[PDB]
Amino acid sequence: ENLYFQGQKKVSILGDSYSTFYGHVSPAANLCWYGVPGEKKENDVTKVEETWWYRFIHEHGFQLERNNSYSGSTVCHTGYEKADYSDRSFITRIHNLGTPDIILVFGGTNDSWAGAPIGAYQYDGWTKADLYSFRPAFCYLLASLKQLYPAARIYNITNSELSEEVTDSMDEICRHYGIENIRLHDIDKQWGHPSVQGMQSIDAQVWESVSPI
Ligand SMILES: [Cl-]
Numbered sequence: 001e002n003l004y005f006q007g008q009k010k011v012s013i014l015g016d017s018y019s020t021f022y023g024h025v026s027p028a029a030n031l032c033w034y035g036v037p038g039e040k041k042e043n044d045v046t047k048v049e050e051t052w053w054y055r056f057i058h059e060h061g062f063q064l065e066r067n068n069s070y071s072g073s074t075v076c077h078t079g080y081e082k083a084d085y086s087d088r089s090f091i092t093r094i095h096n097l098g099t100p101d102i103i104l105v106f107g108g109t110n111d112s113w114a115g116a117p118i119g120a121y122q123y124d125g126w127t128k129a130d131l132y133s134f135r136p137a138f139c140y141l142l143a144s145l146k147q148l149y150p151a152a153r154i155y156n157i158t159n160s161e162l163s164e165e166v167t168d169s170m171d172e173i174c175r176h177y178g179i180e181n182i183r184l185h186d187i188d189k190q191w192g193h194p195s196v197q198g199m200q201s202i203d204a205q206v207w208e209s210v211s212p213i
Contacts, residue, residue, distance in 0.1 A: 008063040012100035013053055014090055014145075015069030017193055018159065018202075019106050021048045024067055027096070031071035033193060043190040045199060052194065052202035053104070060207060065098040075107045076137030077128070078116040091131060091141050094148060103149060104206070105141070106157040108134075112166040121169075123176065135169050142177040155210060157182045157202075161189075182209045 013019050017033035025032060034045050048054050057064050070088055072080065079085035086092065090107045097103060111134045119133025123143070130136040145154055156174050158167060158181055174181035184205055188198035 003061060008061055009101040010065040010099065011053075011057055011062045011102045011104060012065040012097040013067045013069055013104050013106065014093060014097065015053075015067070015104075015106040016073050016110055017069075017071040018109065019051070019053055019067065019069035020071055021051050021054070024048050024051075024054075025069050026066050027068075030069060031073075032069075033071045041191050041193070043193055044196050045194070050196045050199055052199040052206065055199065055203040056206055059203070060210075062102070065100045066096065068093050068096055069106075072110055073107070074110040074114060074116060074137075075141060076111055076116050076132060076134045078114065078132045079110070080114040086128075089137070091137055091144070094141070094144050097149075100149065100152050102210070103145060103152050103154045104157060105145070105154065106159075107141075108138070108162060108166050108170055109159045111137075112162040118165050118169065121173070121176075134166060135173065138170060138173050139176070142173060142179055146177060146179075153213065155180050155182060155206070157206060158184060160184045160187050180209055180213070182206055 020032040022032045022035035073088045074085050075090045077086045077089050117133045119135045122136040122139050126140045156179050158170050171181050187201050188195045
């Protein structure tokens with residue numbers, strides 16, 4: 001039973017703005033949405049201790065391994081205004097998460113908001129071209145995370161208020177790969193990103209799913 005038998009479990013995050021805070025992401029050059037000097041948001045989160053992940057980690061006996069979160073970043077290679085996000089997409093950052101026991105994937109909001117093509121469910125044979133679309137990219141993501149971190153527990157986190165297609169696709173693909181999908185609900189947002197209240201709700205809802213397992 002005792003925590004010291006196996007030590008604290010190490011949590012890494014592969015995220016977007018919702019999981020960012022200035023000075024607390026790796027690589028440090030990853031774009032952040034919260035806590036950025038001279039880029040004040042109309043959103044009441046001002047301290048890292050209010051973030052969902054900091055709360056989740058410090059409340060439940062975990063240790064932060066890596067917070068690889070990047071503002072605006074998409075799961076697939078298609079960004080905003082059809083920009084090429086091959087330089088920052090989730091699927092390009094999957095090797096830089098340290099040595100986690102737990103991986104929390106929290107993406108897809110930008111794929112939804114940018115209107116990235118949905119494409120086809122695809123469980124092998126991925127080309128770079130294919131990976132500009134959402135379904136092949138998210139399949140490739142889980143498939144690759146499972147191969148790189150075969151001993152880790154991987155949880156997907158689905159933002160509320162995304163397109164039907166992005167929402168349904170992540171749930172179906174999580175089911176294919178046997179990954180738990182945390183379907184967030186009733187998340188208070190300001191300027192399209194969680195508020196202090198919203199961050200608490202995310203923390204609590206992630207813990208609802210992670211606790212039993
Ligand atoms: Cl990286």
